[PDB]
Amino acid sequence: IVGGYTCGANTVPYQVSLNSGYHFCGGSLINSQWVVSAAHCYKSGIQVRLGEDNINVVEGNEQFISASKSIVHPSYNSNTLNNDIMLIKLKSAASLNSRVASISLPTSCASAGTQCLISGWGNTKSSGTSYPDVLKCLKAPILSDSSCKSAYPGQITSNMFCAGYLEGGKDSCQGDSGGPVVCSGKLQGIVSWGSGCAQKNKPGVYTKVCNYVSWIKQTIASN
């Protein structure tokens, strides 16, 4: 997260870190056994880390649970990032509490101008690299589809939206991928891609979760 702020320990209780010996992506807890992340985050050997704040120090409240299933959307395209969504089933159920909590899925899509909370442990610099210990947060609005397509001509599908700031300085970044965009208490987006981070005229692009609510439900019910 570039141009954000320290969230505060456990103030985003649905945020998870996906770890393979290091933090590599975010995700969102949607029930005690399932996490939503980005398809581009798929790999073998995922450990889901819940209840995290400082990802480099064991502080209390953490639950580390291996992924038992990682299900990329069948129509995920690794070149366009269309359908950039994955479900992870936990090997055992997380213990839910005030610091480890699910986030609701949308019942309808969000409109342009809706303010959302985007969070992660990704890079905090628009040029070069700095990875934070603690979770960072950014409040950002959903942009109009016209503005999104103007910024990314030929690259925005019906399964994407833009959020953030055209003036530069505030965005998600590498290491935030897979993490949440929450708006009025619903998980409306997944950190997906963009042209650099926090660059002028190049807002973040996010997977449009409202298009996948039925797919998520059917996939969980069958697994």
Binding site: A38, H40, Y152, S177, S192, W193, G194, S195, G196, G204
Partner: peptide, 4 residues
């Protein structure tokens, strides 16, 4: 453009 790159994944995040």
């Amino acid at each position: 453009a790159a994944p995040x």
